[PDB]
């Protein structure tokens, strides 16, 4: 969001599933808000990071 | 007299067909709200129009500025010069319709994508609020300089009716028209042998 | 006669030098507004191809001919404007207009160019046939001068080197 880190947010999630990449998917299905964030610090740094 | 509104019906009409031919189709403010309409769906579908000369486009910018303001309100958090950069700039490209000036919007508020963004919209939706309707007003000022002309040249039809009287008045008793009226003053030397005849 | 078929060549030379010499409201507002939206403009104009009125091209066919031969004096048709209120079908029809006026120019430009290069060398054929009469010494000069096909820079400078022609003519011709 705001100051190179914006806020850290942490979480604890129990899981049937095993696999990692369909695991991270679900999580893309969940934090696209991050993901839109993930851009606008992205555009705002072109060599910050 | 009578030559003198029948000059001021071509006076009028070429004074407007010219405005027309040199209609300000503005590239760099459709630039950027298209720029802008691409930016802020982005914020919004996460949550943290077209023809910019459409006569429609008046209510659609109408609508669109009740679009920002549902979306300003779900956001509610901004200079007072910017906010007279935005209204005295609106008030100048209303009556300077021919010049359209933009402004590279003077930045206080939130770095977020949608308050940079918006507060660009906040600006470039007055702006083709400002454009879009002083081009009605003025438009509809020479249409009804044309149309009071229209009236007078129904008095055309009044006069002796020699029978390019009534050509003169079957050529116009028309309201506005970009097209049809211009052909039309070009076909008229008929005229021309018809008023002198009239009034020699 | 060769004292007016050479006054024939500065002519010829002269105006052909000025043409070259010498559209910034062509060039600019064309380029500006492509990237926006002379071989750019052709395929610019097969470009708003894939991007109105009857009389209104009637106007547009016509003033192209017309500066095609008008060269110097340009037409400038504004726009009529009859078309739909968005800034893209209006615009997309005056750049039209400037990409049939320029490519007008382009050929207007070809054709002057190369008739100005032949009416050169038809007068280069008069001028070894110049060399051809009786037997001067500055007629030997003019062929030595004029046995090359038609250039700018060349044959401007050699223009100020034929001060030996006129009084070639003069005393050739009297």
Same mark, same amino acid.
């Given at each position: 969001?705001?100051?190179?880190?914006?806020?850290?947010?942490?979480?604890?999630? !129990?899981? &049937?599933?095993?696999?990692?990449?369909?695991?991270?998917?679900?999580?893309?299905?969940? #934090?696209?808000?991050?993901?839109?964030?993930?851009?606008?610090?992205?555009?705002?740094?072109?060599?910050?990071? | @007299?009578?030559?003198?509104?029948? =000059?001021? +019906?071509?006076?009028?009409?070429?004074?407007?067909?010219?405005?027309?031919?040199?209609?300000?189709?503005?590239?760099?403010?459709?630039?950027?709200?298209?720029?802008?309409?691409?930016?802020?769906? *982005?914020?919004?579908?996460?949550?943290?129009?077209?023809?910019?000369? *459409?006569?429609?486009?008046?209510?659609?910018?109408? !609508? #669109?500025?009740?679009?920002?303001?549902?979306?300003?309100?779900?956001?509610?958090? +901004?200079?007072?010069?910017?906010?007279?950069?935005? +209204?005295?700039?609106?008030?100048?490209?209303?009556? @300077?319709?021919?010049?359209?000036? /933009?402004?590279? /919007? &003077?930045?206080?508020?939130?770095?977020?994508?949608? /308050?940079? !963004?918006?507060? @660009?919209?906040?600006?470039?939706? @007055?702006?083709?609020?400002?454009?879009?309707?002083?081009?009605?007003?003025?438009?509809? +000022?020479?249409?009804?300089?044309?149309?009071?002309?229209?009236?007078?040249?129904?008095?055309?039809?009044?006069?002796?009716?020699?029978?390019?009287? !009534?050509?003169?008045?079957?050529?116009?008793?028309?309201?506005?028209?970009?097209?049809?009226?211009?052909?039309?003053?070009?076909?008229?030397?008929?005229? #021309?042998?018809? #008023?002198? =005849?009239?009034?020699?």
């Amino acid at each position: 969001n705001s100051d190179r880190q914006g806020r850290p947010s942490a979480f604890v999630v !129990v899981s &049937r599933i095993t696999h990692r990449h369909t695991l991270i998917n679900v999580l893309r299905y969940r #934090f696209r808000v991050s993901r839109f964030h993930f851009l606008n610090n992205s555009i705002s740094g072109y060599g910050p990071s | @007299r009578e030559t003198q509104l029948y =000059n001021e +019906m071509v006076l009028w009409l070429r004074y407007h067909e010219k405005l027309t031919a040199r209609r300000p189709g503005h590239l760099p403010l459709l630039t950027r709200i298209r720029q802008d309409y691409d930016k802020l769906f *982005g914020f919004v579908a996460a949550r943290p129009d077209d023809a910019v000369y *459409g006569d429609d486009y008046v209510p659609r910018v109408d !609508v #669109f500025l009740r679009g920002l303001e549902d979306l300003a309100r779900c956001l509610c958090a +901004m200079r007072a010069e910017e906010v007279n950069r935005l +209204m005295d700039n609106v008030r100048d490209a209303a009556e @300077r319709v021919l010049v359209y000036e /933009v402004l590279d /919007v &003077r930045d206080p508020l939130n770095e977020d994508p949608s /308050v940079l !963004v918006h507060n @660009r919209l906040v600006y470039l939706c @007055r702006l083709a609020y400002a454009i879009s309707k002083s081009w009605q007003t003025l438009s509809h +000022m020479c249409l009804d300089r044309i149309n009071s002309l229209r009236r007078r040249l129904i008095l055309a039809f009044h006069d002796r009716p020699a029978f390019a009287r !009534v050509y003169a008045r079957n050529a116009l008793e028309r309201p506005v028209d970009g097209t049809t009226a211009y052909n039309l003053l070009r076909r008229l030397e008929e005229d #021309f042998l018809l #008023f002198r =005849n009239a009034l020699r």
